[PDB]
């Protein structure tokens, strides 16, 4: 079952174990009807591991695509407080503005955890989109926000 | 050639719980809720306005005014081109913390624009904070002064207008005649 064996590799931040399940025809967004249809994304969120979340899109996996529950991978790694992956998936297109099944967006999620460092991150992606919607001194490096907040927090329930 | 004529980004800093984010909402929606919403990290409104026969377009940073809350300095102010200051005129610890918002726009910035708002100025009974002895300190930083009150929508709109006047004339200061 390849589509198995990447989404556990993911987890286990196993590059070589998911380039394997990739060249034996495993689909990079295969969904585990088992484990509330949770991707390799979503395990690589999980995981921790920003390098196996990079390695998943350049790949091709949707940055977008949900679990049972409606949440996508930005849902859960604003939920587990991994900074560095919220701002990889805002550069790479991630829709902030999804809500699960029980209403909430990343934004919601991050202003009730009270985390100034994913709420700025998401508010100037934000900017961002408002910026482009009108239409450098028009768009925020939010990369450069980020190279000086904590890639995550170990204190947060997460792995 | 963009679809404005000139964009300046404007930041308020001040005190937690002293009027900026009420402030930013009353000038960008006309609204004041009457409710307290901790800012976290920070918020946003870009509006336009029209100066002159030019499109401005104000891109205008709400900053968390807790420490506990607020994300790295630096983001706050990079690419600024206006600061507004806000204290509260029932609290004197916020005015007393002027001088150390002041003191931060300096080791952050090397060329800003700044004004001084002195806001909640709409219970006599409780300001604490006297208007001359504002202005008197206002003078001393030359920087202008306004008093304002969010809530009864007074010079929220002739503060946000200086400040606006303020970076546009730096700006256009250092252009041809
Ligand atoms: N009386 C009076 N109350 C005001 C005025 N402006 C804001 N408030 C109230 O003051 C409280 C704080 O307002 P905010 O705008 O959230 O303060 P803030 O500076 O953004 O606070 P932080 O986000 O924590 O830094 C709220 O209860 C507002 O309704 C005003 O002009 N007059
Ligand atoms: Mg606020």
Same mark, same amino acid.
């Given at each position: 079952?390849?589509?198995?064996?990447?989404?556990?590799?993911?987890? $286990?931040?196993?590059?070589?174990?998911?380039? +394997?399940?990739? %060249?034996?025809?495993?689909?990079?967004?295969?969904?585990?009807?088992? $484990?509330?249809?949770?991707?390799?994304?979503? !395990?690589?969120?999980?995981?921790?591991? &920003?390098?196996?979340?990079?390695?998943? &899109?350049?790949?091709?996996?949707?940055?977008?695509?949900?679990?049972? !529950?409606?949440?996508?991978?930005?849902?859960?790694?604003?939920? &587990?407080?991994?900074?560095?992956?919220?701002?990889?998936?805002?550069?790479?297109?991630?829709?902030?503005?999804?809500?699960? $099944? $029980?209403?909430?967006?990343?934004?919601?999620?991050?202003?009730?955890?009270?985390?100034?460092?994913?709420?700025?991150?998401? #508010?100037?992606? #934000?900017?961002?989109?408002?910026?482009?919607?009108?239409?450098?001194?028009?768009?925020?490096?939010?990369?450069?926000?980020?190279?000086?907040?904590?890639?995550?927090?170990?204190?947060?329930?997460?792995? | 050639?963009?679809?404005?004529?000139?964009?300046?980004?404007?930041?308020?800093?001040?005190?937690?719980?002293?009027?900026?984010?009420?402030?930013?909402?009353?000038? %960008?929606?006309?609204?004041?809720?009457?409710?307290?919403?901790?800012?976290?990290?920070?918020?946003?409104?870009?509006?336009?306005?029209?100066?002159?026969?030019?499109?401005?377009?104000? !891109?205008?940073?709400?900053?968390?005014?807790?420490?506990?809350?607020?994300?790295?300095?630096?983001?706050?102010?990079?690419?600024?081109?206006?600061?507004?200051?806000?204290?509260?005129?029932?609290?004197?610890?916020?005015?007393?913390?002027?001088? #150390?918002?002041?003191?931060?726009?300096? !080791?952050?910035?090397?060329?800003?624009?700044?004004?001084?708002?002195?806001?909640?100025?709409?219970?006599?009974?409780?300001?604490?904070?006297?208007?001359?002895?504002?202005?008197?300190?206002?003078?001393?930083?030359?920087?202008?002064?306004?008093?304002?009150?969010?809530? +009864?929508?007074?010079?929220?709109?002739?503060?946000?207008?200086?400040?606006?006047?303020?970076?546009?004339?730096?700006?256009?200061?250092?252009?041809?005649?």
């Amino acid at each position: 079952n390849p589509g198995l064996q990447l989404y556990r590799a993911s987890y $286990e931040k196993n590059l070589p174990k998911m380039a +394997e399940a990739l %060249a034996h025809g495993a689909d990079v967004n295969w969904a585990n009807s088992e $484990e509330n249809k949770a991707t390799p994304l979503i !395990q690589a969120v999980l995981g921790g591991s &920003l390098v196996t979340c990079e390695f998943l &899109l350049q790949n091709g996996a949707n940055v977008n695509q949900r679990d049972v !529950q409606g949440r996508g991978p930005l849902h859960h790694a604003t939920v &587990l407080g991994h900074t560095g992956q919220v701002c990889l998936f805002l550069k790479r297109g991630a829709n902030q503005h999804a809500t699960d $099944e $029980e209403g909430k967006d990343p934004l919601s999620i991050a202003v009730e955890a009270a985390n100034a460092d994913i709420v700025t991150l998401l #508010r100037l992606a #934000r900017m961002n989109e408002e910026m482009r919607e009108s239409e450098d001194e028009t768009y925020q490096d939010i990369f450069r926000d980020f190279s000086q907040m904590a890639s995550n927090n170990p204190e947060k329930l997460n792995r | 050639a963009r679809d404005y004529d000139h964009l300046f980004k404007l930041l308020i800093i001040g005190d937690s719980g002293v009027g900026k984010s009420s402030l930013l909402l009353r000038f %960008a929606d006309n609204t004041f809720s009457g409710s307290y919403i901790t800012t976290i990290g920070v918020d946003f409104k870009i509006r336009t306005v029209e100066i002159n026969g030019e499109k401005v377009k104000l !891109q205008i940073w709400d900053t968390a005014g807790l420490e506990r809350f607020r994300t790295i300095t630096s983001t706050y102010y990079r690419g600024t081109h206006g600061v507004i200051v806000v204290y509260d005129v029932t609290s004197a610890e916020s005015f007393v913390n002027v001088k #150390r918002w002041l003191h931060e726009i300096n !080791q952050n910035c090397d060329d800003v624009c700044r004004i001084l708002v002195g806001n909640k100025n709409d219970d006599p009974e409780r300001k604490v904070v006297e208007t001359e002895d504002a202005y008197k300190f206002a003078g001393q930083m030359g920087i202008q002064l306004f008093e304002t009150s969010a809530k +009864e929508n007074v010079n929220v709109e002739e503060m946000f207008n200086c400040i606006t006047e303020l970076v546009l004339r730096a700006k256009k200061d250092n252009l041809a005649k």
